[PDB]
């Protein structure tokens, strides 16, 4: 008989180079020598937050007592963006939990124990340097503008909801970073745009997608759900009506197969119903600490897209 | 036989008044009575950070159980900028470690012990109020523009590297604070501008000045050097190339005879070579605490100016 | 959405420009002075927020 013990894996690959086609962090895993630097049995502490907004998802990691060779490989490439993937689970499988580029790295080795630090960004390089220069005339179909701008961003299309037969009412011009322009189109058309684990997600506010996840005491829930406001401020109201404005909170054992834009079903004894996801935070302490995930849910009032 | 014990001195002088010539904090030390208020044998905690950037270097200080007369002298002059100097060393000498103006001061005396607080700025008054209004035509030598703007700033010239026979390509106009205009000229010409302990330093990025300091176990080093990135973010690269982009970290016993723009030689058993300095932080606890200095080094790839 | 530290500054800057930083705008003349030529301008543009509130430029 065994116990139920945690497991994880961390991989470091070649520098990421942006080209003239969508970037996939998967293909950069292999190093010039072939197999990548894998780190399994070392105490690790990490925190990974995810959201549906302009900003990329960022995660922090700490590793104790790394071998000198690995640290040397990171002393080099300090000018470059190494690709990194993280996996976690329970002794039988490990689900992808983050993938991005090493934004920052530093080492402090006071006496007894060295402590390496990381800051990782989910597509930070693309979202902050992809320039654009486009224009359109009166009568252009809005569905064409959306596709044109996304292709400029150079990322795979996770999911998109086209506008239909919508047409521009006035001439438009777009410059600067493509991400910023798209985030502005979100406000005026009730659409949510956010990149996550390399995938572009374009959806409509208020509406939600089946029960892709069910939460219950069998599903490793942790404590009862509690109602928490989804924003730190309140807006004036007429009392688009379809927009968000309500939510709840839940916690569960670590499970990387969840994304901010997904949908979940809450099977508890007090609260029951369907909710959207709005925010994720993954925490982990291998030898000591939690191994759980926190979800911020938001009520929905739109159509079932 | 003795031990190796710490010593320090703190001096407070007359209010600083800016005039029509370079400001020297040295000449304001003497008070109307003559000798200044010197504080030697009182537990003191201080933190002084220094850098090479637009912002002035600021340091914090705390003193316990001050006499009522001294506190009274600071209750007055609360509208004025008193000049302050700080010294530290080891029982045989004390090197100047900071000099500036008292930006802030507050007193809290709950029951047993009063605790005075200070915030000091290195040339804050000059850098934030020196206005300018200048213009030049096509063909003007850039070396003339630089000297004209610095004289406006009203500070002694610590060190400057002239541009040679460079000439303006387009007409230029400058207004507002002189410091801001100079900091903009830095970006477009690969030059570093930063005031420190009253001295103006204008140098060129990438290049460095002899071994003015050597670090080794004999030189009171504290722990091994570790590689740390010199910035909290990574820039996109073509992979001016001469710019910085790499660095290291070291710690040493308190030594005020060091400046951000200097050069140091690192004689350790793993790392060996020459580095620039980029950042300093001086910490100190007289009765209890550290008495060390931390240096952030940056690799260089330019000519040996 | 509103969790990141950068989004807060983004919204704050966006709102700050709304009440200041006026550069150019179209308008229509409503009052004309022929001695020392000057004109009174009524800006035409406006916006309506989702909260049923409107922003009108005053006569200049």
């Amino acid at each position: 008989m065994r116990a139920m013990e945690r497991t994880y894996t961390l991989v470091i690959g070649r520098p990421v180079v942006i080209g003239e086609k969508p970037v996939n962090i998967e293909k950069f895993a292999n190093t010039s020598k072939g197999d990548a630097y894998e780190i399994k049995d070392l105490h690790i502490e990490f925190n990974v937050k995810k959201d549906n907004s302009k900003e990329p998802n960022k995660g922090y990691v700490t590793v104790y007592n790394l071998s000198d060779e690995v640290v040397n490989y990171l002393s080099v490439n300090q000018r470059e963006s190494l690709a990194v993937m993280l996996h976690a689970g329970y002794n039988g499988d490990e689900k992808l939990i983050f993938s991005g580029t090493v934004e920052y790295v530093e080492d402090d080795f006071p006496e007894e124990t060295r402590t390496t630090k990381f800051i990782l960004g989910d597509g930070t390089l693309n979202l902050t340097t992809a320039t654009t220069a486009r224009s359109y005339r009166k009568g252009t179909p809005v569905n064409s503008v959306l596709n044109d701008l996304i292709a400029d961003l150079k990322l795979p299309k996770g999911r998109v909801i086209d506008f239909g037969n919508q047409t521009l009412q006035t001439s438009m011009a777009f410059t600067g970073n493509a991400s910023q322009n798209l985030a502005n189109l979100a406000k005026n058309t009730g659409s949510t745009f956010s990149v996550q684990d390399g995938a572009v997600y374009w959806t409509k506010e208020g509406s939600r997608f089946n029960v892709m996840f069910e939460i219950s005491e069998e599903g490793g829930m942790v404590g009862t759900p509690t109602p928490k406001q989804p924003s730190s401020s309140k807006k004036l109201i007429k009392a688009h009506d379809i927009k968000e404005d309500v939510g709840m909170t839940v916690s569960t054992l670590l499970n990387g197969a969840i994304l901010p834009e997904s949908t979940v079903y809450l099977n508890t004894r007090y609260h029951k119903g369907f909710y959207k996801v709005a925010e994720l935070t993954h925490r982990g302490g291998y030898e000591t600490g939690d191994w759980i995930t926190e979800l911020g849910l938001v009520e929905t009032r739109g159509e079932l897209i | 036989m003795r031990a190796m014990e710490r010593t320090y001195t703190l001096v407070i002088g007359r209010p600083v008044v800016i005039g029509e010539k370079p400001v020297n904090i040295e000449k304001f030390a003497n008070t109307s009575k003559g000798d200044a208020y010197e504080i030697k044998d009182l537990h003191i905690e201080f933190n002084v950070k220094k850098d090479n950037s637009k912002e002035p270097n600021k340091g914090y200080v705390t003193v316990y159980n001050l006499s009522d007369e001294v506190v009274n002298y600071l209750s007055v002059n609360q509208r004025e900028s008193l000049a302050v100097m700080l010294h530290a060393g080891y029982n045989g000498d004390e090197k100047l470690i900071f000099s500036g103006t008292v930006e802030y001061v507050e007193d809290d005396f709950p029951e047993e012990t009063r605790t005075t607080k200070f915030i000091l700025g290195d040339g804050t008054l000059n850098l934030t109020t020196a206005t300018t209004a200048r213009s030049y035509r096509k063909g003007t030598p850039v070396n003339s523009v630089l000297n004209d703007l610095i004289a406006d700033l009203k500070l002694p010239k610590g060190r400057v590297i002239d541009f040679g026979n460079q000439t303006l390509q387009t007409s230029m106009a400058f207004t507002g604070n002189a410091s801001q205009n100079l900091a903009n000229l830095a970006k477009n010409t690969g030059s570093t501008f930063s005031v420190q302990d009253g001295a103006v330093y204008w140098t060129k990025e990438g290049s460095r000045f002899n071994v003015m300091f050597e670090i080794s176990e004999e030189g009171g080093m504290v722990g091994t050097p570790t590689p740390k990135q010199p910035s909290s973010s990574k820039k996109l690269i073509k992979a001016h190339d001469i710019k910085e982009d790499v660095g290291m970290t070291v710690s040493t016993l308190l030594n005020g005879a060091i400046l951000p723009e200097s050069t140091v030689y690192l004689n350790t058993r793993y790392h060996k070579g020459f580095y620039k300095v980029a950042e300093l932080t001086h910490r100190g606890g007289y009765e209890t605490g550290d008495w060390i200095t931390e240096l952030g080094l940056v690799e260089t790839r330019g000519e040996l100016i | 959405y509103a969790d990141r530290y950068d989004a807060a500054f983004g919204i704050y800057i966006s709102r700050f420009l709304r009440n200041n930083v006026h550069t150019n705008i179209r308008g229509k003349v409503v009052g004309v002075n022929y001695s020392g030529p000057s004109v009174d301008v009524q800006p035409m543009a406006y916006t309506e927020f989702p909260s049923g509130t409107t922003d009108r430029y005053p006569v200049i």
């Binding site: 922090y60 902050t128 340097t129 | 973010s233 | 530290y5």
Partner: peptide, 26 residues
């Protein structure tokens, strides 16, 4: 003990600086 607290405050400041300054060609 203030040593422990200063470290956490420093790390939070570092995270905020990273959030403000990231990516970009300049």
């Amino acid at each position: 003990l203030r040593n422990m607290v200063r470290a956490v405050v420093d790390e939070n400041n570092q995270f905020n600086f990273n959030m403000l300054i990231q990516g970009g060609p300049n």
